Each structure stands twice: as structure tokens, then as C-alpha cells.
Amino acid sequence: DLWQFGQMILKETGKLPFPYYTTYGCYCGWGGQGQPKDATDRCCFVHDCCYGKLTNCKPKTDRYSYSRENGVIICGEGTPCEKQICECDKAAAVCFRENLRTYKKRYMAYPDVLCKKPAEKC
Amino acid sequence: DLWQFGQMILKETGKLPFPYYTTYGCYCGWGGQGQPKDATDRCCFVHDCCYGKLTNCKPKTDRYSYSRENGVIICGEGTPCEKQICECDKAAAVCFRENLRTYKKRYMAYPDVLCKKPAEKC
Numbered sequence: 258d259l260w261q262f263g264q265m266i267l268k269e270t271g272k273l274p275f276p277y278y279t280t281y282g283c284y285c286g287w288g289g290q291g292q293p294k295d296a297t298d299r300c301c302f303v304h305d306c307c308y309g310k311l312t313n314c315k316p317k318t319d320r321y322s323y324s325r326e327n328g329v330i331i332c333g334e335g336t337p338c339e340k341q342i343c344e345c346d347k348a349a350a351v352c353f354r355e356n357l358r359t360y361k362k363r364y365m366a367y368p369d370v371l372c373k374k375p376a377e378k379c
Numbered sequence: 380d381l382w383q384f385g386q387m388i389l390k391e392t393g394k395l396p397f398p399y400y401t402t403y404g405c406y407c408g409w410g411g412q413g414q415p416k417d418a419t420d421r422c423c424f425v426h427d428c429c430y431g432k433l434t435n436c437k438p439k440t441d442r443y444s445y446s447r448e449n450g451v452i453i454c455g456e457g458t459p460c461e462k463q464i465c466e467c468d469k470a471a472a473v474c475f476r477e478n479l480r481t482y483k484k485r486y487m488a489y490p491d492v493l494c495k496k497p498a499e500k501c
Contacts, residue, residue: 259398259487266397274397275388276381276439288410288491317398317488365381366439369410 258320261343262304265350268325270357278353282364283372291372297360300352306379307345314338316345323347380442383465384426387472390447392479400475404486405494413494419482422474428501429467436460438467445469 266274282298283291293299308316321339323332330350332343353360388396404420405413415421430438443461445454452472454465475482 259402263395263397273385273395275385275395275401279397279401280381 259317261321261323262346262349265323265325265330265346266353269330269350269354272353276365277360280366282367283369284375286365286367287369287372289375291369292374292376294364294367294372295359295361296356297353298364300349300356302375302377303352304345304349307348308342309379311338311341311345314342316342321346381439383443383445384468384471387445387447387452387468388475391452391472391476394475398487399482402488404489405491406497408487408489409491409494411497413491414496414498416486416489416494417481417483418478419475420486422471422478424497424499425474426467426471429470430464431501433460433463433467436464438464443468 263274266272266278270277272278278285278297278301280286281301282294284293284298285301289302289305293302315338319339319342321332321335321343323330323343325331330347332340332347334340335343385396388394388400392399394400400407400419400423402408403423404416406415406420407423411424411427415424441461441464443454443457443465445452445465447453452469454462454469456462457465
């Protein structure tokens with residue numbers, strides 16, 4: 258579920274989703290309504306695409322099972338949905354993390370106004 | 380700043396903003412774009428109005444000073460902006476908390492689609 262996606266974000270980035278990620282850029286912080294502004298922003302787009310593929314699932318509310326005991330997220334057993342959903346979440350948190358290098362604090366609460374229209378397809 | 384608003388939310392509600400509040404209902408979880416669905420949702424509207432009044436301020440990025448050492452948020456000293464911004468944040472977190480009674484988990488990631496148009500004015 259989003260709660261676990263959230264813990265993963267934090268575990269992986271050291272930043273709690275709000276406000277670092279939930280209000281970021283044009284896609285994370287604007288409901289997927291703008292073209293991602295950078296890597297960090299694109300991770301949310303990839304994240305939505307990933308959930309997009311799980312048509313048969315409730316990615317946002319199905320609680321899966323994972324372990325990050327040794328600092329690496331390992332999705333455990335569960336239904337196929339859970340596992341797939343968890344991979345998504347893992348991937349997105351890994352992605353945020355993998356992009357702390359270009360994370361820009363100034364993209365938080367970015368005016369939607371400078372946000373350009375979604376240009377990529379899942 | 381939003382980081383402190385966030386800590387306040389958590390301190391007061393025991394729920395981290397993401398996903399409990401940032402994805403809630405029609406206003407918190409939809410960029411202020413829908414009419415609040417209930418109390419919890421309305422707190423975000425009140426929160427935006429409160430920042431709305433701080434035209435001369437950067438409510439989202441100005442770091443204020445507050446204390447919640449004895450379980451009650453006390454905004455400390457700072458610039459008038461900081462103090463006012465902090466009151467806003469306090470008020471919103473108190474509001475979330477004061478409305479855990481009707482908080483509905485099913486309003487998280489609520490489809491914008493059922494969201495009705497903003498009908499109140501600050």
C-alpha cells in the first residue's frame with residue numbers, strides 16, 4: 258500500500274514523502290498533471306505507469322510484504338499483485354534515492370503554472 | 380516550512396502526511412482542486428486560506444520556530460511571518476487531529492472524478 262511505498266521512500270532516501278516527494282516538481286507534486294521536471298519527478302511517472310500495469314490490483318491499498326532488514330528492499334511473498342505492486346514501490350523508492358544527486362529542494366511546491374503538458378507514454 | 384507542517388501533522392495525528400493526509404479526499408489529496416469532502420479535507424482548505432493570508436510570506440519555505448515538548452504545539456519567536464505561518468500549520472495539524480474521529484481511510488487516493496467543484500471562499 259501507499260503507507261509501505263512511503264516507508265520505502267524514507268528508507269531509501271532518508272526523506273519522508275511529504276513534503277520532499279509528494280510536493281515535488283510537475284508530476285510527483287502535481288498529481289501527475291505535468292511533464293516530470295527531472296529524474297526525481299520522472300520516478301513518480303514511472304511509478305504510476307508501474308501501478309498502471311497492475312490493472313487487476315489495488316496497488317494503493319493492498320498491503321504487501323517486504324523486508325529492508327539489511328538495507329536493501331526485498332519484496333517478500335504474497336499474492337502476485339502484492340509482489341508486483343511492491344516491485345513498483347521498490348523501484349520508485351530506489352529511483353528517488355538513485356536521484357538524490359539532482360534532487361532540487363526548489364522543485365517542492367513548484368507552481369503548476371510553469372508545469373508543461375505530460376509528454377511521455379508509459 | 381512544509382517539513383515542520385509535516386512534523387506537526389505527525390505529532391498531532393500520529394499519521395505521517397503521506398499518504399494519510401497528502402492523498403486525502405478532494406482538497407488535501409487533489410491539490411485543492413475539489414470541494415473538501417469532510418472535516419479532515421476542510422482542514423487543508425483552511426490551511427491554504429491561512430497561507431493565503433500570509434501574502435508577504437513564504438509559508439512553504441520559511442522555517443519557523445516551535446516547540447511541542449509537552450505535547451502541545453507552541454509556536455516560538457521568529458519573524459511575524461514565521462509566527463503566523465506556524466499558527467497556520469499548528470491550526471491545520473490540530474484540525475487534522477481534532478478530526479481523526481471522522482477520518483476515512485477510504486478517502487485516500489480518492490478519484491478526482493467524484494470530486495465536486497470548490498464551493499467555499501477563504
